[PDB]
């Protein structure tokens, strides 16, 4: 049959168009601007109280409260300014792999190897935190989840699909099926109209929340993609993979822009996050260290060291004032 | 200094006390990870326990001679195992079920899975308890079938004992890390107490070794 050859010639046409639409490189344009000064951050706070490996963290939208998830079966709400514990939620299943914090501040969410996303109400008249909803429609482990408008949540799982839910009914409003391997992460766009997902097929995809369709596919990585994050503008995103490189893609050129790698580092990337202005790019590594890259010149502008095990999760506040890192050594650190 | 911050700090300290208590309670369970190649006898092994909302991971709890066991089965996961296998880095032991009755190159698949698990980078110093199941069907088949179908280099006699010993040695020779981890083999019996006794003895051995390592004597 001719369907496979039709797909092949379509791929050739697409890549030829992408080659045509390329004029210069980001390095050639950027080689005249001032290289940012060498960055030196310090450990301002150390949040301790988890007894097992930390797997995820997420900042509140007020840039003071943050939630963290650990496989000792616990979900902890931290006050970063004073290192006080606000809430400690026990979980039914201890094999948690992701957590989210609602933009309003009223709910939290978590999921894992139970294939169920649990949603907890933080503000009840009884004075305690109670589980309010359990979303169960996935056939694989939950790997990420993000709130949209306090009533809609997007989830990705290891069964190669993504889903958009309705919390009060508990039913999958939409299902996104374009990947061939496990989906490892997703990030929401600032306008919450689009989102991007990375999978173990070494590809990234751009989905439209409305119409439930896939608009664009980006390739270039050599192994599984473990992390993804939008540029603050909303026109580009960055990905980290197991082949020890980060990459920047642009939504409008449908093409890779730059590759962040160094021959002295060979381990994979667990998390990635942009700075407030998009000038810095922070990435967590298996070699127990975090690297701060210049997002425009591709030079390693700094190093965050101090964790005694793999850095699993990373976050930046909405006002750009601090960075939170969580690691398998069961400690969270605030850097400034 | 503090006006209502004192009450918040007191709340934090009570939360800390509760966390320490729950951690101490949880740390006294013995965790086992149960593995196999497509229903090799896992159902029978779980049935030998003495003492649905989820479809991702199954948890079985039992208690033998004052010792508490939690056993995790991840058969119904069927995802990429290398994305979640590191969640079990610090389990006490791995139960591995292998069916002796096989029949299209299924023993080969069991050996391949055992090779992948035993040599995993997350499971060094972790001991394997290897259960061999369905010895009676193996009796009958070896009576009316030669072992050369699976292993062509077999030379020994075509009775049961040499065949079983050869299979056990073929599995046990897949252990590259012979100087760190130990393998405890057992042919499943029909007596209820003996399987649990074997598991209990192996777990006590592993506990003693871990205590010796922690004290700095190993």
């Amino acid at each position: 049959d001719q369907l496979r050859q039709e797909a092949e010639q379509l791929k050739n046409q697409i890549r030829d168009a992408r080659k045509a639409c390329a004029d210069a490189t980001l390095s050639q344009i950027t080689n005249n601007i001032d290289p940012v000064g060498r960055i030196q951050m310090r450990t301002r706070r150390t949040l301790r109280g988890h007894l097992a490996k930390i797997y995820a963290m997420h900042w509140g939208t007020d840039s003071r409260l943050l939630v963290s998830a650990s496989q000792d079966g616990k979900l902890i709400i931290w006050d970063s300014y004073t290192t006080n514990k606000v809430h400690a939620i026990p979980l039914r299943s201890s094999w948690v792999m992701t957590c989210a914090y609602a933009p309003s501040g009223n709910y939290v969410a978590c999921g894992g190897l139970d294939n169920i996303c649990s949603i907890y109400n933080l503000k009840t008249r009884e004075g305690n935190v109670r589980v309010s909803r359990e979303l169960a429609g996935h056939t694989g482990y939950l790997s990420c989840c993000r709130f949209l408008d306090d009533n809609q949540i997007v989830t990705s799982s290891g069964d190669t699909t993504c889903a958009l839910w309705d919390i009060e009914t508990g039913q999958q409003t939409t299902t996104f099926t374009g990947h061939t391997g496990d989906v490892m992460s997703l990030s929401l766009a600032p306008d919450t109209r689009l989102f991007v997902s990375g999978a173990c097929d070494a590809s990234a995809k751009l989905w439209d929340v409305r119409e439930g369709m896939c608009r664009q596919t980006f390739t270039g990585h050599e192994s599984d993609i473990n992390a993804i994050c939008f540029f603050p503008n909303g026109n580009a995103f960055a990905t980290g993979s197991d082949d020890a490189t980060c990459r920047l893609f642009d939504l409008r050129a449908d093409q890779e822009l730059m590759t962040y790698s160094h021959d002295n580092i060979i381990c994979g990337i667990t998390s990635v996050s942009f700075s407030k202005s998009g000038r810095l790019l922070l990435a967590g590594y298996d070699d127990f260290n975090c690297n701060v890259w210049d997002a425009l010149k591709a030079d390693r502008a700094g190093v965050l060291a101090g964790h005694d095990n793999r850095v699993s999760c990373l976050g930046v506040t909405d006002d750009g004032m601090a960075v939170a890192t969580g690691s398998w050594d069961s400690f969270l650190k605030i850097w400034n | 200094l503090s006006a209502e911050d004192k009450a918040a700090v007191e709340r934090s300290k009570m939360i800390d006390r509760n966390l320490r208590e729950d951690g101490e309670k949880a740390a006294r369970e013995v965790k086992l990870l149960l593995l196999g190649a497509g229903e090799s006898g896992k159902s029978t092994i779980v049935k030998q326990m003495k003492i649905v909302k989820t479809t991702g991971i199954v948890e079985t709890h039992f208690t033998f001679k004052d010792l508490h066991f939690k056993m995790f089965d991840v058969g119904g996961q069927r995802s990429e195992r290398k994305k979640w296998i590191h969640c079990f880095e610090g389990v006490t032991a791995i139960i591995f079920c292998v069916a002796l009755s096989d029949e299209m190159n299924r023993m080969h698949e069991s050996m391949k899975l055992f090779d992948s698990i035993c040599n995993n980078k997350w499971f060094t110093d972790t001991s394997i308890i290897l259960f061999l199941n369905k010895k009676d069907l193996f009796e009958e088949k070896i009576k009316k079938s030669p072992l050369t179908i699976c292993y062509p280099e077999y030379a020994g006699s075509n009775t049961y004992e040499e065949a079983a010993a050869y299979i056990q040695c073929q599995f046990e020779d897949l252990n590259k890390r012979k100087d760190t981890k130990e393998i405890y083999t057992h042919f499943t019996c029909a007596t209820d107490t003996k399987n649990v006794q074997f598991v209990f003895d192996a777990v006590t051995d592993v506990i003693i070794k871990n205590n010796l390592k922690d004290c700095g004597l190993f």
Partner: single-chain antibody
Amino acid sequence: VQLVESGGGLVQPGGSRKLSCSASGFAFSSFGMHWVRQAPEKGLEWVAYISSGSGTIYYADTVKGRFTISRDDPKNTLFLQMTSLRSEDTAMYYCVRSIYYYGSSPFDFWGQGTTLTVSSSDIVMTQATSSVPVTPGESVSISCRSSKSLLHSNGNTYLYWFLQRPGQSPQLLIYRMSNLASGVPDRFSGSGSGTAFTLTISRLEAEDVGVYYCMQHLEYPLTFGAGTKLEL
């Protein structure tokens, strides 16, 4: 959420009496508790406080020694034992719950209170006006004044506003001087600075009439200040 008090009545002076407060419908062990008394035709007076976990206890100077507060968590029962009953201890007693963490609203639910009748404070809050006739649909502004500055080094201003309708318990309206309570219409608002504060009501309805109290939560004793009646 229910708090029900019991144990009041007529007591000969010099005796001892025990009041109890039973809670049902919330996590009792996670809340600190207060006893607050109101004298007949007078304002509100803070009496005693016990924290969550029973690790901190505070008494007013006028009840120190002869009053003792305690709680029993399994039965969800707070209680107060009183000895040497003087003549100033004739009042209606209220059981109040309060929880303290970042962003919480203390003093949010008040009990019903029990009447005790016996036969025979570095911060001052000065709520100047006694009574103000009002009309529905009018904007009203109550004011409160404090001797010390209520601003703290951490940016908070610890002022609270309570409304008591005729014949009922007080209820919280505004906490920390600008935070509207839960279940309170946006008609009420609060503002101020340092030592001078105001509560503003845009439109007024028949169920807004009552006595308004300001309260400070900055320091060791909690002081209210006499209320401002708001009639029509």
